[PDB]
Structure formats: C-alpha cells, structure tokens
Design an enzyme around this catalytic site. Structure first.
Site, mmCIF file in Angstrom:
data_model
loop_
_atom_site.group_PDB
_atom_site.id
_atom_site.type_symbol
_atom_site.label_atom_id
_atom_site.label_comp_id
_atom_site.label_asym_id
_atom_site.label_seq_id
_atom_site.Cartn_x
_atom_site.Cartn_y
_atom_site.Cartn_z
ATOM 1 N N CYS A 163 0.808 -1.241 0.000
ATOM 2 C CA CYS A 163 0.000 0.000 0.000
ATOM 3 C C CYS A 163 0.824 1.265 0.000
ATOM 4 C CB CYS A 163 -1.015 0.022 1.151
ATOM 5 S SG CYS A 163 -2.037 1.516 1.209
ATOM 6 N N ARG A 198 0.032 4.622 2.738
ATOM 7 C CA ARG A 198 0.157 4.449 4.195
ATOM 8 C C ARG A 198 0.504 5.682 5.024
ATOM 9 N NH1 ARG A 198 3.869 -0.582 4.823
ATOM 10 N NH2 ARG A 198 4.429 -0.134 2.617
ATOM 11 N N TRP A 208 -9.310 6.504 -0.833
ATOM 12 C CA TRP A 208 -9.625 7.226 -2.059
ATOM 13 C C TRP A 208 -8.626 6.755 -3.126
ATOM 14 C CZ3 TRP A 208 -8.385 10.099 2.498
ATOM 15 C CH2 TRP A 208 -7.029 10.519 2.599
ATOM 16 N N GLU A 265 -4.987 3.801 -10.817
ATOM 17 C CA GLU A 265 -5.777 2.589 -10.585
ATOM 18 C C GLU A 265 -6.945 2.554 -11.582
ATOM 19 O OE1 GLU A 265 -6.241 1.510 -6.268
ATOM 20 O OE2 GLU A 265 -5.811 3.654 -5.983
HETATM 21 C C1 HEM Z 1 -6.037 6.730 1.683
HETATM 22 C C2 HEM Z 1 -6.093 6.335 0.413
HETATM 23 C C3 HEM Z 1 -5.336 5.101 -0.106
HETATM 24 C C4 HEM Z 1 -4.614 5.077 -1.236
HETATM 25 C C5 HEM Z 1 -4.347 6.261 -2.221
HETATM 26 C C6 HEM Z 1 -4.097 3.742 -1.368
HETATM 27 C C7 HEM Z 1 -3.333 3.290 -2.406
HETATM 28 C C8 HEM Z 1 -3.222 1.954 -2.704
HETATM 29 C C9 HEM Z 1 -2.908 1.386 -4.001
HETATM 30 C C10 HEM Z 1 -2.676 2.153 -5.346
HETATM 31 C C11 HEM Z 1 -2.821 0.053 -3.815
HETATM 32 C C12 HEM Z 1 -2.519 -1.013 -4.891
HETATM 33 C C13 HEM Z 1 -3.843 -1.341 -5.575
HETATM 34 C C14 HEM Z 1 -3.617 -1.980 -6.914
HETATM 35 O O1 HEM Z 1 -2.714 -1.557 -7.651
HETATM 36 O O2 HEM Z 1 -4.374 -2.897 -7.274
HETATM 37 C C15 HEM Z 1 -3.083 -0.261 -2.433
HETATM 38 C C16 HEM Z 1 -3.077 -1.540 -1.919
HETATM 39 C C17 HEM Z 1 -3.522 -1.897 -0.665
HETATM 40 N N1 HEM Z 1 -3.969 -1.031 0.337
HETATM 41 FE FE1 HEM Z 1 -4.107 1.026 0.082
HETATM 42 N N2 HEM Z 1 -4.487 2.969 -0.284
HETATM 43 C C18 HEM Z 1 -5.309 3.770 0.495
HETATM 44 C C19 HEM Z 1 -5.950 3.392 1.680
HETATM 45 C C20 HEM Z 1 -5.944 2.140 2.251
HETATM 46 C C21 HEM Z 1 -6.690 1.731 3.412
HETATM 47 C C22 HEM Z 1 -7.670 2.613 4.224
HETATM 48 C C23 HEM Z 1 -6.365 0.464 3.673
HETATM 49 C C24 HEM Z 1 -6.879 -0.453 4.817
HETATM 50 C C25 HEM Z 1 -7.197 0.109 5.990
HETATM 51 C C26 HEM Z 1 -5.449 0.025 2.664
HETATM 52 C C27 HEM Z 1 -4.886 -1.223 2.599
HETATM 53 C C28 HEM Z 1 -4.374 -1.770 1.438
HETATM 54 C C29 HEM Z 1 -4.074 -3.171 1.232
HETATM 55 C C30 HEM Z 1 -4.274 -4.367 2.202
HETATM 56 C C31 HEM Z 1 -3.493 -3.256 -0.157
HETATM 57 C C32 HEM Z 1 -3.014 -4.552 -0.890
HETATM 58 C C33 HEM Z 1 -4.255 -5.180 -1.498
HETATM 59 C C34 HEM Z 1 -3.973 -6.523 -2.128
HETATM 60 O O3 HEM Z 1 -2.918 -7.174 -1.872
HETATM 61 O O4 HEM Z 1 -4.868 -6.933 -2.909
HETATM 62 N N3 HEM Z 1 -5.190 1.067 1.819
HETATM 63 N N4 HEM Z 1 -3.257 0.933 -1.738
HETATM 64 C C1 LIG Z 2 -5.075 -11.990 -7.401
HETATM 65 C C2 LIG Z 2 -5.140 -10.751 -6.555
HETATM 66 C C3 LIG Z 2 -4.557 -10.742 -5.302
HETATM 67 C C4 LIG Z 2 -4.634 -9.591 -4.535
HETATM 68 N N1 LIG Z 2 -4.056 -9.594 -3.315
HETATM 69 N N2 LIG Z 2 -5.279 -8.492 -5.003
HETATM 70 C C5 LIG Z 2 -5.844 -8.481 -6.234
HETATM 71 C C6 LIG Z 2 -6.576 -7.265 -6.783
HETATM 72 C C7 LIG Z 2 -5.859 -5.950 -6.517
HETATM 73 C C8 LIG Z 2 -6.899 -4.834 -6.413
HETATM 74 C C9 LIG Z 2 -6.726 -4.043 -5.116
HETATM 75 C C10 LIG Z 2 -7.903 -3.110 -4.874
HETATM 76 C C11 LIG Z 2 -7.631 -1.604 -4.727
HETATM 77 C C12 LIG Z 2 -6.680 -1.311 -3.549
HETATM 78 C C13 LIG Z 2 -7.054 0.021 -2.892
HETATM 79 C C14 LIG Z 2 -7.636 0.012 -1.632
HETATM 80 C C15 LIG Z 2 -8.001 1.181 -0.980
HETATM 81 C C16 LIG Z 2 -8.627 1.064 0.389
HETATM 82 C C17 LIG Z 2 -7.761 2.402 -1.604
HETATM 83 C C18 LIG Z 2 -7.182 2.384 -2.885
HETATM 84 N N3 LIG Z 2 -6.924 3.531 -3.529
HETATM 85 N N4 LIG Z 2 -6.862 1.221 -3.511
HETATM 86 C C19 LIG Z 2 -5.788 -9.619 -7.024
#
Ligand code: HEM
Ligand SMILES: Cc1cc(N)nc(CCCCCCCc2cc(C)cc(N)n2)c1
Ligand code: HEM
Ligand SMILES: Cc1cc(N)nc(CCCCCCCc2cc(C)cc(N)n2)c1
Ligand SMILES: C[C@H](O)[C@H](O)[C@H]1CNc2nc(N)[nH]c(=O)c2N1
Ligand SMILES: C[C@H](O)[C@H](O)[C@H]1CNc2nc(N)[nH]c(=O)c2N1
Ligand SMILES: [Zn+2]
Lengths: 411, 407
Positions: A108, A111, A280, A285
C-alpha cells in the site's frame, strides 16, 4: 541485525531493524525469489502466544508495558481462551489493531494516512440484513459528498470457521461484466464470474456497461443474501478531458469510493473474515489498470483512434500517448467534481516521506516494490529508485479464498 | 518444490522445474524478500567444472559418452596438476551464450543463441586489449545494423594478475563537476572521469565527450586509449513533430556495451568480458535522459512544450517523458541504427519465456528489472509472474577496480 536500503537517486541509506519482528513467511528462499508471485479454526495452543505478542505490542504503544493493567489483561485473555477457546478484543485494541494492519500493508502506497482511519465496530452484527445496514453507513460516511474519509467496518471474527461473516463482493462498489454469446464482454470483464453468481442468486441485471453490482452478504455462515446499495449513496464521476471535447462521448465514468471487501484482518491471532475498508483512489488505478488493461475496459485503441495517433507501429508510442491522456482525464474529472483523488507523483512522494519517517521512528517500513511502483511512468517517481524490504508484520490484511469455492450451501 | 507461474492477463500457467538446478543465493529468506535490492582452490574448482561439462555434454547429446568421461578426466588431471584448467573453444562459446541465457535481468534474451564470441584469451597487454576492443566495437556496430558480441580476455589466475576494463561500458560520456556546483555531462561518470584526468586524459570538458578506455592487463596498472572516433556511432536526437527538439543539442551512442561484469564458466572467472547488443529505447529516453541523477532533461522539455508545470496532476512529467521517448526511437530509426521499443521487446521476452518453459523447464527472470521504466502495465511482462534464481554460467557484478587495485 541491521539491513540497509539505498536510494539510487539520492544515495540516502536507511537501516532496518523492524524486520526482526517479522513472523509470517514471504514465499522466498535463499534459492528462489517469489517477489512477483501474486499469491505467495486455530487451536488454544497457537492462540495465546499470538494474543500475548499483540497485547505486548499494544501495551508498549500506549507506554504501559508491564503495568498492572497490562498483566491483568494478559491474565484475563489467557483465562478467556482456556474456558471459551477464543477471546474478545476491547474497542481500543480493535482500533489499534485495524490501524496497524494498514500500517503493515507492504503493498500500500497510501500508508502516510494510516493513523487517520475511522473504525466502525460491527461485532454486534448477526444477520446479512444487519451487514447491509452497516455497509450503507460505511459508504455514506466514507463518501462524505466527495470529501473522502478512510474507514473500515469490522464484522464478528471467525469461530469454528463454519460460521464466517463474508462479503462476497471483492469491492463494495464495482461494475457488472457480462460475457456475450459472441465472446465479447459488456461492462467490466474482471467481474464476470461474480456477476453470474449475482444473477443466479436472482439479481435482475440491467445489462449495461456500468451497472453497479448488488452486495452479496453472508452472516454467521449462512447462505449469502442480495441487497442493492441505494443508488443515491454511490458517488460516480463522468470522465471528460480538459482539452479533448470528444473524450466525454466515450461514455466513461467511474465510482469515487475504492473499498476492498474480500480480505481477512488478523489481530492477535483472531480472524476477521469480513472487514471492508476504503480510502480514495490514486488516478492510475482507474486510468491505467481499470481502463487500459487488456483484460479490463481495454479502451487504449479507441482513444488512440480518436487522437489520430500513428497506430501502424508500436514504436510511435501511440499506446503510451493515449495512456497519458486517459489519465489526465481521470484526474481532471475527479478534481472538477471535487471528489478526492491523488496523482501518482504526489502519492509516491508522500510515500517516500512516510517511509523515511517510519525508518526513523519505527526502525523500518516493509514495502513491496512490485506493487508500490505505479503502473505508468515508473522511473520518474521517487519509489522506483528506492530499495525496499518486504516482510510480514502482524496485525495484517491477508488474502482469503473466494467464498463461492469454499461455502457449504445450506439451501 | 515444482513451481507454477501465472500470467494474470492471459491466464496461462507455466510450471518451473529449472529452478531445481539453481546454485548461487538470492539474498532472500523466508522472513524477508530482497527482490528490490540492486546488490543483495582445487577443492571447489573440480565440482564447478564437472557441473558445467555435464551440462555441456548433455546439450550436444553426448552425456555419459567416452568423449564426455575423457574430458572430465582430462580436466581433473589439469586442475590437480596446474590448479586450474582451460576451456575448449566450443565450451567457451557454449558458456558465454548460456551466461546471457541465464541473465535473469535481461529482457533481450530471445537473442541469446545469436552471440558472436571473440576469444581473446591469447591477449597479454593493454595494447592488445585495445585492439580487440576496437574490433569488437566495429564488428558489433556494423554501420548501424547492430550484432550481439562478447570479447573474452584471459581468466583469473591467482587474482593478482586480473584483466579488467575499468570503464563500466565501452562507450560512455564524461562527467565534470563545475565551479557552478552543477554537473556538466553525465553525472554518473564523474568519479571515472576524475581517474581518467588523474591518469593523464586531456578532458575536452564538453557535455558529450566519449570517455577513453582504461585497460588493465595481467594485473598491471591500467593504461589510457582513445576509441577511434570514427568507430563510435552516435545519433543526434530529433522529434518527428517538434522542430525545436533538435535545439536541445541531445545525442546518444548506438552501441550499449557492458564492460565491468565478471563471466563465470565452470568455476573459471573471466574478469574482463565486454559484451554488447542494441538498445531498448527507454534505456536512453527514460533512464539516461530523465533520471534526476543523470541528464535530467524533463523540465527543459516540458517548458518547450508549454505544459502546465504548476501541479503534478496535469501529468506534464508523463507527457514530456513520452515525447522524449518518441524522439529517441525516431532518431535511431531515421539513421538506421538498430533499436527496439519496449512494447516489441517485452512481447519478444514473453515468447522467449514460453519457449524456455517449453524446452528448458523455466526461465529465471527478475520482474523489477524486466518491466520497463515507463508504461509498465501496458506491456505484457507486467502481468507475468516470474521466478528469480541464479544459474551458472553467469554474469556477476564485481567491485570497481580502483577500490581494489594496488597502484
Ligand atoms: C487513503 C487512500 C489510499 C490510497 C491512495 C491507497 C493506495 C493503494 C494502491 C494504489 C494500492 C494497490 C492497488 C492496486 O494496484 O491494485 C493499495 C493496496 C492496498 N492497500 Fe491502500 N491505499 C489507500 C488506503 C488504504 C486503506 C484505508 C487500507 C486499509 C485500511 C489500505 C490497505 C491496502 C491493502 C491491504 C493493499 C493490498 C491489497 C492486495 O494485496 O490486494 N489502503 N493501496
Ligand atoms: C489476485 C489478486 C490478489 C490480490 N491480493 N489483489 C488483487 C486485486 C488488486 C486490487 C486491489 C484493490 C484496490 C486497492 C485500494 C484500496 C483502498 C482502500 C484504496 C485504494 N486507492 N486502492 C488480485
Ligand atoms: C540484443 C539486445 C539486448 C537488449 C535489447 C537487452 C536488454 C536489456 C535491458 C533493457 C536491460 C536492463 C538495462 C538497465 O536497466 O540498465 C538488460 C540487462 C542485462 N543484459 Fe541485456 N540486452 C541485450 C543484449 C544483451 C547481451 C548480448 C548480453 C550478454 C552477452 C546481455 C546481458 C545482460 C545482463 C547481464 C543484464 C543485467 C546487467 C546488470 O545487472 O547490471 N544483454 N538487458
Ligand atoms: C550498482 C549497479 C549494479 C548493477 N548490476 N547494474 C547497475 C546498472 C546497470 C547498467 C546496465 C547497462 C546496460 C544494459 C544493456 C546491456 C546490453 C548488452 C544491451 C542493452 N540494451 N542494455 C548498477
Ligand atoms: C505478476 C505481477 O506481480 C502482477 O501483475 C502485479 C504487479 N504489480 C502490481 N502492482 C499493483 N499496484 N497492482 C497490481 O495488481 C499489480 N500486479
Ligand atoms: C531499487 C530498484 O531495485 C532499482 O532502482 C532498480 C529498479 N529497476 C530497474 N530496472 C532496470 N532495468 N534498470 C535499473 O537500473 C533499475 N533500477
Ligand atoms: Zn524475494
């Protein structure tokens, strides 16, 4: 032990000690790196250690380590586990836990924001209808008429693994995909399978390009149930381009609220199988992945045609050109409608400041380079040149199997 | 222990069995991934030789043959008696090609079997090294129709007699720190230029001055040599629509040629083994021109384009980046100098990777290096899971020699 990371643009070197607290495994060994692999009931016995480790962390953070309150709380959780086989988190522990799972999320980039997270405690929820109401309130609070606020809603933890709460949607808000008899796809090809499940469960599909999916909610291990999110709660942005007047006629729009609903939250050995969270968007994305992946809306060619780019050879970089213009359009649109969004330059810059701060104050910041680097213009962002160390801290968010593969249907 | 990689765009799943033959260490453990870290006697030598010759004899389908057993015994006797051994020409060629094949960070490996190997093991002086290197440059450049090549100087002996090319690439531009405090030329080459000046080079003090070669033979002090200017093919950079682009005064050289790596074959170490191919456009247009610590030209270009540079969200950096990369590809193509764009290169690498899984049981690949530094997710490698592991023969990093050389 000290591991060092270098930034190859600034020659700044950081020292990680925090990795000494990692527990879960990476997938890698001394012989193979799995850094780009996407997917790399507990007993009483394993549980008290996991609880103790978490409570020691919590009590340290509040500067009460070894206090009477700390000792009494260990004793109280010990006994609870012995007689009931699990335990209940206090609200303060749950809040701290949820915040830390985000802080620890190595994939993420967002963070810097981890300490501002609104935690909605839904552990008193018992039915799918209850879940729906909780999720509507989350969506409404998080959306805040465009001024987005991060939030998480946490439903009752796992017990025997036969009574799980689950949101079957991968995200609270997503568009349907329909495979046509001619092999083409209407709407979002990523959500085709889930859309078939919704239809099979009795959703009446509008069959358009941007149909907001219904929620499919499982409470206490029961068969899931369908609910439509009230349309007035779903903020959407029509996509237009600041200079190209034909862009609007592509008919594109996207929703403002990204909200992951299929992950598992682990705090002190407890498993929250339904814990939807939202923040947000970063513009890429939508503009890079959602719109330009070949397996998604796949709009590159149509955009490049309209720009009259030379499409006869890849070396004209027509794809790169259309890609940038689409991404300008997404940021312009969200900004014009006052819906919070961050560009990839701003987000990665904030991330590097966050990362340096964490090294100084916490002794590290686990980060997954493969995911942190944006999917366009990688090397002109400061994360590209930053060495990172990926390891697993708890509390954490984890992947879990899709519930349709594992669910025991009652009928 | 047998591993699957999935492509998330196409759903194609491949099985890797080749990783079981992996030898060196990755830097990773089960607790910590170091995927993004840039740098993570007779006794030892015979097993290394055997492991190599076994794979060699296997490749020409003579495994276990008398000729196989005879060479193994021959090499064994040679090591015991001389403390080292010499490769046959055929083994040398096989090994160099396989070191490229095994280079997990190289997107251009579809080409691995088309590598011209120049055997310079008979070379004894720095002057001889210079002659060999000019011939390499001329052969590889081929008036713009570039051909892959490697020149292999004598192998390490007691480590006090190393052959080394001190330059990081055969062709690079000088870097000088100015009274101004800014940097003229390529900031990456400031230290190397200083050593050159210190050794006597008369620096022209321009923005694109081709560095002299600093060559070390037989562990002697290195000597300076200027590559004949007529052998250094350069390309003036222009844009097909922006008339003003040529006025930036930009050029780059046609031949990418790495000269600071160590080639290890069957336990033998070739400390000077310059090798060359042809460029992928983004290497020049994204990295050389746009890295903050390199020529850093994004701002100048954006200004000439008159983009809104007030806020990052207008994506002016991204726009200017694309235009610079169009100009690079356009200029190399107009001058008929071989270049590949990142779409075509990564598409070729995916086809290569499927061939290798099909025919070899895997292809070690380092995703962090394979994915181009711009437009990552619109190239097919972004969606491709890859497994990274170390096979020999191999190219390895080695310490800069000025830190190491006793003068
Ligand atoms: C505040 C705005 C936030 C932004 C701009 C942001 C940005 C991102 C982005 C760009 C990704 C990768 C998504 C992708 O490329 O598919 C991501 C992944 C992730 N974020 Fe954030 N994030 C935000 C808030 C949060 C929040 C609130 C949480 C949980 C409390 C969070 C937890 C995660 C987790 C667990 C992943 C990995 C997801 C996965 O492995 O599928 N994020 N974040
Ligand atoms: C196969 C697979 C595994 C995995 N861990 N995750 C995926 C999909 C990845 C999409 C992540 C969803 C968006 C993450 C996100 C989450 C939040 C809370 C804010 C933000 N701007 N973006 C596919
Ligand atoms: C034929 C055209 C070739 C292309 C298009 C190509 C492409 C590339 C690219 C884009 C990189 C990453 C460069 C960077 O980001 O700095 C790379 C790395 C590398 N390539 Fe190639 N390559 C070619 C030929 C060769 C040859 C002939 C060899 C060896 C004989 C080779 C061996 C290597 C090695 C060892 C690396 C990683 C170098 C390091 O770790 O510093 N490549 N390749
Ligand atoms: C500290 C450090 C370590 C390392 N392994 N590598 C670097 C920089 C890598 C320089 C790569 C040189 C160019 C790669 C290349 C080589 C060839 C032969 C063809 C082609 N198109 N491109 C720095
Ligand atoms: C195979 C590869 O790991 C996979 O395509 C990853 C690469 N990096 C990513 N990075 C982000 N932020 N999101 C993703 O979905 C992916 N996909
Ligand atoms: C820290 C990170 O590993 C480093 O900046 C890498 C990233 N990927 C790269 N990829 C290539 N092809 N070349 C590079 O120099 C780098 N730099
Ligand atoms: Zn790893």
């Amino acid at each position: 032990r000290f591991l060092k990371v270098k930034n190859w643009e600034t020659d700044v070197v950081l020292t990680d000690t925090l990795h000494l607290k990692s527990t879960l495994e990476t997938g890698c060994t001394e012989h193979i790196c799995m850094g780009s692999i996407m997917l790399p009931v507990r007993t009483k016995d394993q549980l008290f250690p996991l609880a103790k480790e978490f409570l020691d962390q919590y009590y340290s953070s509040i500067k009460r380590f070894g206090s009477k309150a700390h000792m009494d709380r260990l004793e109280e959780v010990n006994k609870e586990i012995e007689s009931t086989s699990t335990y209940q988190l206090k609200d303060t522990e749950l809040i701290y836990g949820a915040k830390h799972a985000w802080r620890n999320a190595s994939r993420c980039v967002g963070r810097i924001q981890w300490s501002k997270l609104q935690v909605f405690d839904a552990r008193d929820c018992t039915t799918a209808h209850g879940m729906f109401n909780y999720i509507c309130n989350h969506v409404k609070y998080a959306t805040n008429k465009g001024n987005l606020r991060s939030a998480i809603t946490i439903f009752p933890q796992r017990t025997d693994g036969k009574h799980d709460f689950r949101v079957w949607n991968s995200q609270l808000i997503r568009y349907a995909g329909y495979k046509q008899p001619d092999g083409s796809t209407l709407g979002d090809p990523a959500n085709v399978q889930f859309t078939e499940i919704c239809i099979q469960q009795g959703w009446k599909a509008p069959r358009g390009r941007f149909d907001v999916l219904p929620l499919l909610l499982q409470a206490n291990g029961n068969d899931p149930e369908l609910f439509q999110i009230p349309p007035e709660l779903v903020l959407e942005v029509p996509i237009r381009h600041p200079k190209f007047d034909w862009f609007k006629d592509l008919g594109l729009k996207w929703y403002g609220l990204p909200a992951v609903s299929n992950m598992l939250l682990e705090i002190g050995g407890l498993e929250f199988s339904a814990c939807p969270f939202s923040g947000w968007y970063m513009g890429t994305e939508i503009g890079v992945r959602d719109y330009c992946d070949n397996s998604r809306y796949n709009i590159l060619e149509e955009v490049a045609k309209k720009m009259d780019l030379d499409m006869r050879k890849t070396s004209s970089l027509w794809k790169d050109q259309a890609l940038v213009e689409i991404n300008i359009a997404v940021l312009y649109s969200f900004q014009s409608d006052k819906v919070t969004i961050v560009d990839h330059h701003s987000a990665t810059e904030s991330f590097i400041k966050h990362m340096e701060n964490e090294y100084r104050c916490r002794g590290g910041c686990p980060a997954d380079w493969v995911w942190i680097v944006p999917p366009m213009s990688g090397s002109i962002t400061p994360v590209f040149h930053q060495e990172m160390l990926n390891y697993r801290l708890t509390p954490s968010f984890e992947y879990q199997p899709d519930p349709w593969n594992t669910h025991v249907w009652k009928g």
